[PDB]
């Protein structure tokens, strides 16, 4: 939905 959550997701 946003890019940090994004980034959080694939970590």
Same mark, same amino acid.
């Given at each position: 939905? *946003?890019? /940090? *959550? #994004?980034?959080? #997701? /694939? *970590?």
């Amino acid at each position: 939905h *946003a890019l /940090y *959550a #994004c980034i959080r #997701c /694939y *970590a």
